[PDB]
CSV table of all heavy atoms in Angstrom, one decimal:
chain,number,residue,atom,x,y,z
A,1,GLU,N,16.5,-45.4,20.6
A,1,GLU,CA,16.3,-44.5,19.5
A,1,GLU,C,17.4,-44.4,18.6
A,1,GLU,O,17.3,-43.9,17.4
A,1,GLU,CB,16.0,-43.1,20.1
A,2,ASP,N,18.5,-45.1,18.9
A,2,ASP,CA,19.7,-45.3,18.0
A,2,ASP,C,19.7,-46.7,17.5
A,2,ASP,O,20.6,-47.1,16.9
A,2,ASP,CB,21.0,-45.0,18.8
A,3,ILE,N,18.5,-47.3,17.6
A,3,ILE,CA,18.2,-48.6,17.0
A,3,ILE,C,17.0,-48.4,16.2
A,3,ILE,O,16.9,-48.9,15.1
A,3,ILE,CB,18.0,-49.7,18.1
A,4,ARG,N,16.0,-47.7,16.7
A,4,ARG,CA,14.7,-47.5,15.9
A,4,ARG,C,14.9,-46.6,14.8
A,4,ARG,O,14.4,-46.8,13.7
A,4,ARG,CB,13.7,-46.9,16.9
A,5,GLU,N,15.8,-45.5,14.9
A,5,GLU,CA,16.1,-44.7,13.7
A,5,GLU,C,17.0,-45.4,12.7
A,5,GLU,O,16.9,-45.1,11.5
A,5,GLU,CB,16.8,-43.4,14.2
A,6,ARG,N,17.8,-46.4,13.1
A,6,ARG,CA,18.6,-47.1,12.2
A,6,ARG,C,17.8,-48.2,11.4
A,6,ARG,O,18.2,-48.6,10.4
A,6,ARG,CB,19.8,-47.8,12.9
A,7,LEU,N,16.7,-48.7,12.0
A,7,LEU,CA,15.9,-49.7,11.3
A,7,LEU,C,14.6,-49.0,10.7
A,7,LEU,O,13.8,-49.7,10.1
A,7,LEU,CB,15.4,-50.7,12.3
A,8,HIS,N,14.5,-47.7,10.7
A,8,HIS,CA,13.4,-46.9,10.2
A,8,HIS,C,12.1,-47.3,10.7
A,8,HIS,O,11.1,-47.3,10.0
A,8,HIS,CB,13.4,-47.0,8.6
A,9,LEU,N,12.0,-47.7,12.0
A,9,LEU,CA,10.8,-48.1,12.6
A,9,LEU,C,9.9,-47.0,13.1
A,9,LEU,O,10.3,-46.2,13.8
A,9,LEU,CB,11.0,-49.2,13.7
A,10,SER,N,8.6,-47.1,12.8
A,10,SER,CA,7.6,-46.2,13.3
A,10,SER,C,6.7,-46.9,14.2
A,10,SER,O,7.0,-48.0,14.7
A,10,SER,CB,6.8,-45.7,12.1
A,11,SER,N,5.5,-46.4,14.6
A,11,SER,CA,4.6,-47.0,15.5
A,11,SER,C,3.8,-48.1,14.9
A,11,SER,O,3.7,-48.2,13.7
A,11,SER,CB,3.6,-45.9,16.1
A,12,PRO,N,3.3,-49.1,15.7
A,12,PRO,CA,2.7,-50.3,15.1
A,12,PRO,C,1.5,-50.1,14.2
A,12,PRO,O,1.2,-51.0,13.4
A,12,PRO,CB,2.2,-51.1,16.4
A,13,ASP,N,0.7,-49.0,14.3
A,13,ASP,CA,-0.4,-48.8,13.5
A,13,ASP,C,-0.1,-48.4,12.0
A,13,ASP,O,-0.9,-48.5,11.1
A,13,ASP,CB,-1.3,-47.6,14.1
A,14,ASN,N,1.2,-48.2,11.7
A,14,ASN,CA,1.7,-47.9,10.4
A,14,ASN,C,1.9,-49.2,9.7
A,14,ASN,O,2.0,-49.2,8.4
A,14,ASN,CB,3.0,-47.1,10.4
A,15,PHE,N,2.2,-50.3,10.4
A,15,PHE,CA,2.5,-51.6,9.7
A,15,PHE,C,1.3,-52.5,9.6
A,15,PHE,O,0.5,-52.8,10.5
A,15,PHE,CB,3.6,-52.4,10.5
A,16,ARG,N,1.0,-53.0,8.4
A,16,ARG,CA,-0.2,-53.8,8.0
A,16,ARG,C,-0.3,-55.1,8.9
A,16,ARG,O,-1.4,-55.5,9.3
A,16,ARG,CB,-0.1,-54.2,6.5
A,17,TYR,N,0.8,-55.8,9.2
A,17,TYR,CA,0.8,-57.0,10.0
A,17,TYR,C,0.6,-56.7,11.5
A,17,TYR,O,0.4,-57.6,12.3
A,17,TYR,CB,2.1,-57.8,9.8
A,18,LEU,N,0.6,-55.4,11.9
A,18,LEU,CA,0.4,-55.1,13.3
A,18,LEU,C,-0.8,-54.1,13.5
A,18,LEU,O,-1.2,-53.9,14.6
A,18,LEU,CB,1.6,-54.4,13.9
A,19,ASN,N,-1.4,-53.6,12.4
A,19,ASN,CA,-2.6,-52.7,12.6
A,19,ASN,C,-3.9,-53.4,12.6
A,19,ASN,O,-4.9,-52.8,12.8
A,19,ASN,CB,-2.5,-51.6,11.6
A,20,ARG,N,-4.0,-54.7,12.4
A,20,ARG,CA,-5.2,-55.4,12.5
A,20,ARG,C,-5.4,-55.8,14.0
A,20,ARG,O,-5.5,-55.8,14.4
A,20,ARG,CB,-5.2,-56.7,11.7
A,21,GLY,N,-5.5,-56.2,14.7
A,21,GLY,CA,-5.7,-56.6,16.1
A,21,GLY,C,-5.4,-55.5,17.1
A,21,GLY,O,-5.5,-54.3,16.9
A,22,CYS,N,-4.9,-55.9,18.3
A,22,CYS,CA,-4.6,-55.0,19.4
A,22,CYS,C,-3.1,-54.6,19.3
A,22,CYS,O,-2.2,-55.3,19.2
A,22,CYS,CB,-4.9,-55.8,20.7
A,23,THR,N,-2.9,-53.2,19.5
A,23,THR,CA,-1.6,-52.6,19.4
A,23,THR,C,-1.2,-52.2,20.8
A,23,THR,O,-0.1,-51.7,21.0
A,23,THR,CB,-1.6,-51.4,18.5
A,24,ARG,N,-2.0,-52.3,21.8
A,24,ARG,CA,-1.7,-51.9,23.2
A,24,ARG,C,-0.5,-52.7,23.9
A,24,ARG,O,-0.4,-54.0,23.7
A,24,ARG,CB,-2.9,-52.0,24.1
A,25,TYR,N,0.3,-52.1,24.7
A,25,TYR,CA,1.4,-52.7,25.4
A,25,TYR,C,1.0,-53.2,26.8
A,25,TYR,O,0.1,-52.6,27.4
A,25,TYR,CB,2.6,-51.7,25.6
A,26,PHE,N,1.7,-54.2,27.3
A,26,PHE,CA,1.4,-54.7,28.6
A,26,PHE,C,2.3,-53.9,29.6
A,26,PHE,O,3.3,-54.0,29.6
A,26,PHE,CB,1.8,-56.2,28.8
């Protein structure tokens, strides 16, 4: 969380290149 807040990263459904297909984790 001291890497995700520094890169301004949110959940995959917010990004166009990741909201088309499957967003589920293994």
